[PDB]
Each structure stands twice: as C-alpha cells, then as structure tokens.
Paper text:
RNA ligases of the RTCB-type play an essential role in tRNA splicing, the unfolded protein response and RNA repair. RTCB is the catalytic subunit of the pentameric human tRNA ligase complex. RNA ligation by the tRNA ligase complex requires GTP-dependent activation of RTCB. This active site guanylylation reaction relies on the activation factor Archease.
To address the issue of nucleotide exchange, we determined the structure of nucleotide-free RTCB with a single Mn2+ ion to a resolution of 2.6 Å. In contrast to our complex structures, the nucleotide-free RTCB structure contains only one Mn2+ ion in position A, coordinated by residues C122, H259, H353 and one water molecule in tetrahedral geometry. The lack of electron density in position B indicates a vacated metal binding site in the absence of a guanine nucleotide. The conserved residue H227, which coordinates a metal ion in position B, is not involved in metal binding and rotates away from this position compared to all previously solved structures. Concomitantly, the α-phosphate-binding residue N226 is moved out of the nucleotide binding pocket. The displacement of both conserved residues, which is not present in previously solved RTCB structures, is due to a rearranged loop region from Q218 to Y228. The conformation of both loops in our nucleotide-free structure changes the accessibility to the guanine nucleotide binding pocket. Hence, the structure of nucleotide-free RTCB provides an additional open conformation of RTCB-type ligases with regard to the active site. The concerted movement of both loops suggests a latching motion towards the GTP molecule during the initial nucleotide binding step prior to guanylylation. Strikingly, the conformation of the aforementioned loops in the open state would sterically clash with binding of Archease. It should be noted that the engineered His tag and protease cleavage site were still present during crystallization of this RTCB construct.
Residue numbers in the entry: -9 to 153, 159 to 433, 446 to 466, 475 to 505
Write the structure that this text describes.
C-alpha cells in the first residue's frame, strides 16, 4: 500500500480539502463524496463509533499531511478506489473494522450488477486466503467440566492436527475442490447437520478444479514438513454473556458457562496461489477489455471475460477446499473431545452452530433502488449476515437471522451476531468479521487462565468497539460473548 498506484492526480491535496469530500450521514456512518479519488462511480461510506472515527481520520491525516516518507494508503482512500470500479452499485462500504489491504481494504464491501457488461470481479476484493472463515461448535459440557482437563484437551487437539482426514492425493483434492463439504460427508469426516448449518451448505456450485493451477493444488496437499505455518487456529471457549436468550436457545446455547469450540481456517496456499495466478492473468488482459483502475492491486477482469470466468470457478473451488479443511478440524476436534471425556462425539452434542466465510465473492439477489438485481458481492474481511426469513438460510435460523461469528485473537473475546433486515437494506447483508488495525504473551495468557498450544513462537480496532458499532448502526445484532480458555494455533 504505497507505490502500487499508477501515476494519477487528486494527490495535490491537504487534510482540509480531503475533509471537504467527507460528510457524516448519521451517528454511526460517514459519507465519502465523489472526487475523493479519481473516477468514482458511486459514493463511499464507512461505519464508526467515536473511537473508530478518531483512528480513521487520524490515518487520513498521517498520510495526507505527508511531510515524511511512506505514502501509506489510508483505508478511506482504498474505499474510494473500490468505488471507481466498473459495475459497482449502491456504494463501496467500510465496515467498522475496515483497515488497509491489497487493492480492496480489509473490511470494505462492494457489489457489482451481473447484468452490467462492464461489471468486473476483483481477486483483491476476495483476499488471498480465499474463504478463511469461522466455525462454532457447541458442547453439552460446562466450564466446570472442561476447566480441569483443559491442558489435556488442548494437547489432544494439538496432537490431532498432524497425521487421511484431509485430501492426501491430488485425485481426492480434485474431488474436494469440486464437492466441498460433500466430500467430507462421503469420507466420514462430516455430519449431515454440519452442512445444514453452514454457509452455502459448505459447497459452492460450479467450482472447477481445472481452473486451479497445479502449483495451487500442491500448496493444498498435506505436508508433514513445513507444519507450523499457522493456518490452523482453534479456541476452546466459554459462553461469557448472552445478549439474546432466544437467539442463543435456537443455537443450543442454554446458559452462561457452556463450552464451545471455535475453528478458524482457510485455503492455506491453494487460495493464495489461485488469487495470484488470477491477478497475473488479469493484469495481462485488462488492456484487451480496456479496464481502468487507480490501483494496480485493484487488478480485475470482467465477469464476462474468460479470465473473470476462470477466477470465479477457481475461487469457488478454493472455497470448497477451505470448508473441507474446517470439516476435518471439526472431525479432529470431535475426536479430541471424545477421547478426553471417553465417550462418543454425538453424546457431547458437538454440532455445528454455524459456519461463515469472510474472504469470498457470492452471487446474491438484492434490491437496488426498488429493482431486484443479481449482484456479485465482494467480501474480503467481511461476513455475510442475512436477515430473518431469508428463504435460503437454515430453517433453524429463520426467526433469529443468520448467525455471525466474530473471530477473537489470543486472549480476546469472540462474539456471535445475528443478521438483520436493516443490514440487508444498507450493507447488502454484510457485517464485520472481527478486529482491525491502525514468553511475555505466554505468561499473560497463563495468568489469565488460558491454556495455549502454539507450534512456533512467531505466532488496534477493538472487537468490542467494532461489534458495538455494528449493533448501534443496526446492521448486526449482538447475541453471545465467548471467552477463551484454551488456544491452539498450529
Ligand atoms: Mn479468517
């Protein structure tokens, strides 16, 4: 986020001229008027509380004022660059946890009309870790039941990570990329109820393994070497607060102190490679279709392009692979819990509460200016949050709205949110994904009471401020707060 811009204008400005393009819509939302960056097709908006508002406008002035080396790209500027993409509708939107990233800002959503021939798809609008996501499992155990054996549970979970639960040959992987969680179901590593409580039923149709490069496929095949890359993250959690008892009851969360397990994983290097190969092929074809962007990292292809069609089919394939990896972690988590407590996984009520993505592009029906349209919704660092009574969400959540899982870092709380009708109207059903940015840790976590198994010692916008901002804006609703007692990052 520095010299990736083409030689362009609008850069002979100071903080006061940039403030001219900025107006506050309401208590929790700001407007970016056109002209903030070149070639804006729609306006931009971001959601703030008084704290996150300070950091956003400080990051603007620190880069805008200049007077030093850097030229760092503010999140407010990347929002506008995304608003300059052909095909975008409504507005490019920054969720409360918006921070700067490759082309798109992390936490910056934008949707494109699939009936517009100039509409494009941007891999930078999905992210390199395609379909990194969160999965929440409930248990019938209480904190008093788990707190004594938390070290053994964490060790058993850590020891279960390395070992056929994951596609171990290229042929199995080609099926996993095509079938998503349907591969795990056939191979015994997933329950049927896991699919019904999973975004897109754990499988994105029309995925094509032929659109995934051979290097990408080998990046996704298991390696006994190079373990410790950090792609596996798990957290044994305790229900610390229930803001909505009925939403919690429909998720099986019966009381405070109940134990849950949170799983965080993605496509590892397969998605990184799928995103990279697309970016290269798109750079070479943007001229043929005459696409103009402000940021070279906004490299995109038209949806109708062969390169745009290839990416989405490959992107869907990596998303399927990510669900297979989280199902295998579920299978190993279920096995870890089964052995420590010496029973069967079902007798511990180890069902999937929900599973969301936050690095994916989805084809969704949305109403734009009173007209139903088919939109390609880019969500990098943002979570889908469908409202109550959406016909395509689980029957169990037809009255609560779609559960939204918020990732919590080491020692940080996690949240379960619900979708809202207001979020479908304002943000196309989009909400935050977690926190943003801009041995000592070991003893702090131990003193907090958190057992920790981490492979290598190599391994801000507060999540609380972010979820409270979304709750106040009405684009999400707080339901559960979870506290970690064991963190497993291998
Ligand atoms: Mn993630």
């Amino acid at each position: 986020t520095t010299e990736n811009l083409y030689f362009q204008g609008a850069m002979s400005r100071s903080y006061n001229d940039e403030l001219q393009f900025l107006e506050k819509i309401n208590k929790n939302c700001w407007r970016i008027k056109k002209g903030f960056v070149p070639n804006m097709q729609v306006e931009g908006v971001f959601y703030v509380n008084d704290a996150l508002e300070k950091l956003m406008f400080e990051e603007l002035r620190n880069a805008c004022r200049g007077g030093g080396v850097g030229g760092f790209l503010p999140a407010m500027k990347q929002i506008g660059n995304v608003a300059a993409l052909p095909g975008i509708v409504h507005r490019s939107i920054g969720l409360p946890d918006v921070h700067s990233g490759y082309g798109f800002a992390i936490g910056n959503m934008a949707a494109f009309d699939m009936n517009d021939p100039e509409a494009v798809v941007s891999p930078g609008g999905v992210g390199f870790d395609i379909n990194c996501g969160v999965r929440l499992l409930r248990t019938n155990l209480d904190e008093s039941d788990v707190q004594p054996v938390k070290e053994q549970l964490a060790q058993a979970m850590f020891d279960h990570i390395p070992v056929g639960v994951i596609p171990m040959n290229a042929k199995d992987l080609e099926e996993a990329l095509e079938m998503g969680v349907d591969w795990s179901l056939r191979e015994g590593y997933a329950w049927a109820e896991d699919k019904e409580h999973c975004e897109e039923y754990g499988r994105m149709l029309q995925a094509d393994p032929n659109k995934v490069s051979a290097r990408a496929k080998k990046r996704g095949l298991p390696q006994l070497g190079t373990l410790g890359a950090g792609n596996h993250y798990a957290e044994i959690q305790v229900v610390d607060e229930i803001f909505n008892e009925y939403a919690a009851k429909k998720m099986g969360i019966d009381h405070k102190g109940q134990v849950c397990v949170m799983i965080h994983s993605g496509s590892r290097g397969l998605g990184h490679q799928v995103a990279t190969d697309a970016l290269v092929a798109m750079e070479k074809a943007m001229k043929r279709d005459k696409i103009i962007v402000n940021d070279r990292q906004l490299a995109c292809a038209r949806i109708a392009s062969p390169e745009g069609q290839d990416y989405l089919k490959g992107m869907a394939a990596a998303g399927n692979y990510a669900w297979v990896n989280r199902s295998s972690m579920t299978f190993l988590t279920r096995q870890a819990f089964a052995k420590v407590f010496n029973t069967t996984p079902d007798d511990l009520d180890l069902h999937v509460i929900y599973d969301v993505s936050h690095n994916i592009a989805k084809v969704e029906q949305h109403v734009v200016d009173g007209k139903e349209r088919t939109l390609l919704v880019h969500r990098k660092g943002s979570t889908r949050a469908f409202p109550p009574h959406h016909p395509l969400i689980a029957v169990d959540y037809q009255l609560t709205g779609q559960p939204v899982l918020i990732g919590g870092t080491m020692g940080t709380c996690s949240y379960v949110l619900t979708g809202t009708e207001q979020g479908m109207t304002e943000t196309f059903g989009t909400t935050c994904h977690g926190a943003g940015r801009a041995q000592d840790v070991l003893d702090k976590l131990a003193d907090m009471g958190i057992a920790i198994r981490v492979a290598s010692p190599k391994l801000y916008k507060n999540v609380t401020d972010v979820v409270n901002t979304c709750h106040d804006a009405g684009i999400s609703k707080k339901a559960i707060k979870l506290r970690p007692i064991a963190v497993i990052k291998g």
